[PDB]
Design a protein around this motif. Sequence first.
Motif, mmCIF file in Angstrom:
data_model
loop_
_atom_site.group_PDB
_atom_site.id
_atom_site.type_symbol
_atom_site.label_atom_id
_atom_site.label_comp_id
_atom_site.label_asym_id
_atom_site.label_seq_id
_atom_site.Cartn_x
_atom_site.Cartn_y
_atom_site.Cartn_z
ATOM 1 N N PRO A 120 36.519 47.964 45.393
ATOM 2 C CA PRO A 120 35.543 46.526 44.639
ATOM 3 C C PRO A 120 35.456 45.665 45.525
ATOM 4 O O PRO A 120 34.354 45.080 45.699
ATOM 5 N N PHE A 121 36.258 45.229 46.363
ATOM 6 C CA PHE A 121 36.071 43.967 47.058
ATOM 7 C C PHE A 121 35.308 44.165 48.470
ATOM 8 O O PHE A 121 34.626 43.196 49.022
ATOM 9 N N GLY A 122 35.166 45.568 48.884
ATOM 10 C CA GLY A 122 34.271 45.819 49.736
ATOM 11 C C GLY A 122 34.935 45.596 51.179
ATOM 12 O O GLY A 122 33.908 45.067 51.987
ATOM 13 N N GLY A 123 35.846 45.611 51.341
ATOM 14 C CA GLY A 123 36.576 44.908 52.719
ATOM 15 C C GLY A 123 36.942 43.496 52.604
ATOM 16 O O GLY A 123 37.155 43.076 53.693
ATOM 17 N N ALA A 124 37.108 42.715 51.516
ATOM 18 C CA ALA A 124 37.309 41.472 51.568
ATOM 19 C C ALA A 124 38.782 41.139 50.838
ATOM 20 O O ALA A 124 39.339 42.066 50.061
ATOM 21 N N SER A 125 39.123 40.108 51.422
ATOM 22 C CA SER A 125 40.586 39.436 50.810
ATOM 23 C C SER A 125 40.425 39.078 49.513
ATOM 24 O O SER A 125 41.502 39.425 48.537
ATOM 25 N N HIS A 126 39.774 38.168 49.193
ATOM 26 C CA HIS A 126 39.238 37.558 47.715
ATOM 27 C C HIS A 126 37.835 37.932 47.201
ATOM 28 O O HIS A 126 37.099 38.400 47.977
ATOM 29 N N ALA A 127 37.672 37.624 46.091
ATOM 30 C CA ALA A 127 36.486 37.823 45.354
ATOM 31 C C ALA A 127 36.397 36.881 44.087
ATOM 32 O O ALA A 127 37.402 36.752 43.465
ATOM 33 N N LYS A 128 35.012 36.490 43.760
ATOM 34 C CA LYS A 128 34.949 35.594 42.739
ATOM 35 C C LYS A 128 34.426 36.717 41.565
ATOM 36 O O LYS A 128 33.788 37.566 41.686
ATOM 37 N N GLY A 129 34.622 36.361 40.187
ATOM 38 C CA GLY A 129 34.065 36.799 39.096
ATOM 39 C C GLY A 129 34.188 36.096 37.775
ATOM 40 O O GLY A 129 34.786 35.085 37.866
ATOM 41 N N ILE A 130 33.538 36.857 36.831
ATOM 42 C CA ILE A 130 33.539 35.998 35.381
ATOM 43 C C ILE A 130 34.392 36.842 34.449
ATOM 44 O O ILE A 130 34.595 38.114 34.438
ATOM 45 N N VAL A 131 34.984 36.150 33.754
ATOM 46 C CA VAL A 131 36.190 36.627 32.896
ATOM 47 C C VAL A 131 35.486 37.113 31.752
ATOM 48 O O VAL A 131 34.699 36.362 30.992
ATOM 49 N N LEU A 132 35.651 38.468 31.489
ATOM 50 C CA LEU A 132 34.908 39.334 30.359
ATOM 51 C C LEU A 132 35.738 39.372 29.094
ATOM 52 O O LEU A 132 35.176 38.942 28.093
ATOM 53 N N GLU A 133 36.898 39.923 29.440
ATOM 54 C CA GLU A 133 37.892 40.059 28.259
ATOM 55 C C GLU A 133 39.278 39.670 28.812
ATOM 56 O O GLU A 133 39.756 39.543 29.713
ATOM 57 N N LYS A 134 39.982 39.398 27.580
ATOM 58 C CA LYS A 134 41.399 39.049 27.820
ATOM 59 C C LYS A 134 42.300 40.478 27.298
ATOM 60 O O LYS A 134 42.564 40.523 26.067
ATOM 61 N N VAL A 135 42.628 41.509 28.024
ATOM 62 C CA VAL A 135 43.282 42.528 27.662
ATOM 63 C C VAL A 135 44.988 42.585 28.253
ATOM 64 O O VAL A 135 45.044 42.233 29.346
ATOM 65 N N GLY A 136 45.628 43.031 27.451
ATOM 66 C CA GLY A 136 47.108 43.046 27.478
ATOM 67 C C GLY A 136 47.548 44.478 27.549
ATOM 68 O O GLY A 136 47.671 45.293 26.763
ATOM 69 N N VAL A 137 47.827 44.977 28.833
ATOM 70 C CA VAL A 137 48.120 46.190 29.267
ATOM 71 C C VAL A 137 49.828 46.493 29.045
ATOM 72 O O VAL A 137 50.533 45.632 29.355
#
Lengths: 24, 210, 132, 139, 98, 81, 129, 81, 213
Positions: free
Chosen positions: D39-56
């Motif tokens: 998912p990062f495409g070879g990146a160390s970090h990444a920004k994203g938008i919080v969609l849900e709060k799921v407890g696994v």
Amino acid sequence: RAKWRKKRMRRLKRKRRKMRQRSK
Amino acid sequence: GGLDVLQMKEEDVLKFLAAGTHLGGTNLDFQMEQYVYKRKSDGVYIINLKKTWEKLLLAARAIVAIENPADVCVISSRNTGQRAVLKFASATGSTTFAGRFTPGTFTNQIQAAFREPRLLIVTDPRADHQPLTEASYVNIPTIALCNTDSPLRYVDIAIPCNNKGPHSVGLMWWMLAREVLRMRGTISREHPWEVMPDLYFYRDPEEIEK
Amino acid sequence: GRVRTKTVKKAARVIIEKYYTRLGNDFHTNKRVCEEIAIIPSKKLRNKIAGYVTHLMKRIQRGPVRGISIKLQEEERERRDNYVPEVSALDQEIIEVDTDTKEMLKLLDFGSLSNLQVTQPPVGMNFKTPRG
Amino acid sequence: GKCRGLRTARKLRNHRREQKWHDKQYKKAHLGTALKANPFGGASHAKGIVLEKVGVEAKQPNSAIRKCVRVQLIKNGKKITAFVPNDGCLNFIEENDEVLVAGFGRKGHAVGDIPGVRFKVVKVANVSLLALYKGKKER
Amino acid sequence: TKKRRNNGRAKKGRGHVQPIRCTNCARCVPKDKAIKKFVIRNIVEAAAVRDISEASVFDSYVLPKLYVKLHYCVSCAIHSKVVRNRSREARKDRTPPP
Amino acid sequence: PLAKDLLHPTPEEERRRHKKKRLVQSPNSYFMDVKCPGCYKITTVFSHAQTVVLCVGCSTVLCQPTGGKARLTEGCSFRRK
Amino acid sequence: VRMNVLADALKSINNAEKRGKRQVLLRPCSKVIVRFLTVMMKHGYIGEFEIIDDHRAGKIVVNLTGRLNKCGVISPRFDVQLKDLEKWQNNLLPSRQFGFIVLTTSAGIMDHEEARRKHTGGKILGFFF
Amino acid sequence: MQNDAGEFVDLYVPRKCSASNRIIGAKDHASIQINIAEVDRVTGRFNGQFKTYAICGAIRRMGEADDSLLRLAKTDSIVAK
Amino acid sequence: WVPVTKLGRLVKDMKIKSLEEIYLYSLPIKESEIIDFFLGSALKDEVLKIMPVQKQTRAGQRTRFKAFVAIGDYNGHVGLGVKCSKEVATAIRGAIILAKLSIIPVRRGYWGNKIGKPHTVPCKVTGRCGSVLVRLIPAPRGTGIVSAPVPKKLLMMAGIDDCYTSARGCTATLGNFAKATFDAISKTYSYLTPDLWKETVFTKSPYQEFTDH
RNA sequence: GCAAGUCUGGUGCCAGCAGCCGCGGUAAUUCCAGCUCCAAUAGCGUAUGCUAACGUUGCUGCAGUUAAAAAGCUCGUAGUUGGAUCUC
RNA sequence: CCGGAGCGAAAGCGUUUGCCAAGAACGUUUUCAUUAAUCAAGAACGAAAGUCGGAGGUUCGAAGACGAUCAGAUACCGUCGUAGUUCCGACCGUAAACGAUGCCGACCCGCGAUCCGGCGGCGUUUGACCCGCCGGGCAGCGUUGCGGGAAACCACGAGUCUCUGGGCUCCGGGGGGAGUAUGGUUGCAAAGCUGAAACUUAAAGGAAUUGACGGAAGGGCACCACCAGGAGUG
Ligand SMILES: [Zn+2]
């Protein structure tokens, strides 16, 4: 029995060929 | 002994031919081939008596090289030479294991019988394999009356002779006891020894009464 | 269940090697020796020891037991072990020597001896056992 | 055995060239796969938008609801699950805000008793989540 | 792990041997792997040979024997108590039991 | 058998081992001058004759073909050496 | 089927030395093998070997003195210069105190110390220590 | 083993097997050091002299200890050739 | 100390001068008091690892602790001993006994020039125990012991100040790791070097030199 | 592992800790805090690439009986490597 | 008869006789004179089942019917029986096709047998048997505690490996996904060859050891087992 895992695999591959043959 | 004084005499050859010390059975060890003269028609390997006498002198040189006679040990677990090593020990002053050799007398120090000799003389290498292998964990040279089919796994002075016949093995103990005392100064080598060679011969219970 | 335990086996043997002339072939006399010599807090145990000593004494007078030995009987066998015939079994009048053993003597210096009978070798080589 | 011949530099080079592909760590870094699927495409970090709060739920023999968040990346629109590292920091997570997620220890591998979560959130709302846990950068 | 150096058969220098049939189960067993057992027993039992002897119309007639060549598979040669499971060092004894 | 001298072997060991595994290779066969009562001349024949050998004049047969050396007939001489 | 005569020569010497033998028979002989044994004999690792002069490849009977630890070949005969000779010394010799690397310079077969004194490299045959 | 100045640095110089030149280790308990006594030429009595031979445990274990002492004795002329 | 063997009786009565006299004839040292008689002053031990092994029985698991103790005088002598006893303290003391009985001389050589006391191994030696094999390569005078913590304790107690180690195999097994290093150390005095090609002159064995005593 | 506390209190398979093995199911040396202590150090953690570790890519230098593994077997070109023999 | 014996590159191969052309080993002072070894690409052969086309179908016997057993058997057991099994040609090229161990070469232990050929030795028997020896072949035993290995075990080396290099081919890189997907290709088909990835996982596995267990074997023990009975219970 690893031979029947090969029996069911050849049976699943044979079904995938019939599904892919009717999409010609 | 390469000297003319230590050469075997006529009296020694007659005893060897009488006791049967020139018969090595039907089998032959590959390390005992140098001591065999020729195989006769009945599969018996004739032991070279000159090689026997040379190894007998060589073994005597090793026994007399031990200052304390107690540091020399003779073991015979087979009944064919049980009394042969008893008369041998009394003639030279050595220790002896005439009965059954207990495994551990050379290695187990806290054991009661912990005789640690400097030179072991074995009657039969095959029958007394336990004293031989036990004499490997401690630096003890081993002499053995080796037959033509005897393993030499830890035998450094192999005396080629017939250790199967009672009169044959009894003579070798008498010959060795005589030559050891001759190299020490007990026997003048001119007059024959007072001890008869039949004193070392084993007697089966059927003839002990006679 | 007449088999003694190691308490009776060992005690009956160490009492003989230390006291052999004391014990005879009578259980009742041997029973009284153990009272003065050994200290045992049981009476039935003393009768088992003295009873087994009586069994050993019949074997000792018969011969040397495989456990221990005495000095009165060993001297009998020691002299019997010192037995030597008037004529030794080796120095016989004539010694039978095969042809191959004779050539070995001819190679050495003692090739011409008086008491040597050259025995003819046995024809045929059947010295091996049949296999199977 | 191996060919040792003096003119076998080509045979030795081509053999090691084709056998390096049988190495998992080499084949994942020298093919198109494991880079486009990342998912990062070879990146160390990444920004994203919080969609849900799921407890696994953690795996056996453990029993604890691992607090993570379903985050959709901004760089490529992929939806991943970033794990809220500290205790009670799930309450500090805002809804539909920017979070700087990073890897979770092992590279592309689930860490600990969590079944398949392989990402963790580092910053929340353009500020570090560690400060929100230690009473700093009140936001 | 390899339990026997000969793999439980007498195939040395060959790739395939003729399979034969067992006796009490009729299983295809290789010729070299078969448990040979040459049974040679009298036609009449020793407990009944005396009744047949006195009923014989002749003076001296030796009763013949039943020469049967039996083949056993490994699973049946052990159930029939023909062969047993020996110790690790006892399996190397190829000598027939006395 | 650790200090067995290899450069000076006994003539018995050299004669016993293979014709190629010696220090210097040497043939094990030989030639013989068979002298039958028919032909009075010396005719050399290989030990492993491998063929029907005949002397000058073709009086009689010398060697029957065998696997190894020749089976000489009655009335044949030797190497004569 | 051979592909090397010096390999089978030093392999026979290495085995017979470890088996406690006093003399070893080398089935094939060659001038490269003879000059190889001379380098070992000059340094005191083998005795006086006798070349069986046959009208063939020839045999050699080497007198083993037990002073040898191992003799081996380096196949193929790599081209060793003087700048990289120090590298082969750390990969083939036990220590800097003993052991020699037999090189084939342009002046003939010699060890690595003689090649450094003569200031010339060459192809490597083997080693001994 | 010196130190470029004539100083021997080894704490002890081990023995070498007189049969195979192998160094007898400190724990080679199967090794022996047998003494073969010397006798006078005219009489043949032990005169306090002896020929010392050491055999390592490996050679002794394989059975080459009797053939070695036999050959080592012929080197010192202790036994006949 | 009452000696039970004739070797212990000689060293008790000051017949054998140095411990190297026993190594010269490869005599089995069966009494631990012989070791502390010569090197008892400077002899530091170290418990390498206490590995509890268990014997599955009907009552469950019978725990029995093993003790790997390394003993060396830090110059020319090192020993390794194992002991599997019920109590931890008994296994440690028992291993110290066997570590002294298994002590062995280690030869130290030079790297290049020979100036001063020896610092490294004489040559490349390899010891094997199970699967793990180690190699001791000579190293310059100021490199120290380049090895894992397990073989470093053996090389320091053996007097080896500098060494290059190449350990392969299952080095995680501390038992076989130490025994493989100790086996490589033992091969330093069994490696035939040109400085040992001199024909050895034999002397009288202590059993022969003091036979009347 | 890996240098440093069965310290203090509550939280009790919950919340969490944990790169790995693993810690919580009412006396947690792991977590939620104090004190103290430890490689530290004006730097120190985290994520990812990469190097050593890795003789787990082995030319140096690995493996292929049973742990991943010699094509069922043989022929066969290119390729690779090739018996001894010429002034020491 | 038939074996831890032979032959062949393997799969494989045993009734008689006849026909047909091969092959190792041995024999050789024959002949040829380095013409080699291993081998991508390519090819012959390749147990059995299966497939297409004929004959024949005894027995066996996929499938299938039925009889039994079980809580349930679509099985083992039983009766019966299609395809198949048998033969003929063309395909298929897959096996635990295993010695789970590539080929060639050197070196490196011993002994007793065995197989073929050769060689030389008392004898017996009109080649047979006896005692050896040299060369290869299948193997075995003993020592591996002269080595190797994780060990079991290994001299058809699995030895000569950190003291690492004789030559060459193929092939393995944690366990799964998966011999799956896709592409190419072969085939009448079944399928063969080639062959991934995403993803998931901290173990999977090898050898050995001690316990437990077995519906495994052997031995032994007690009127809480029986035999012989005697009391009483039901
Ligand atoms: Zn069957």
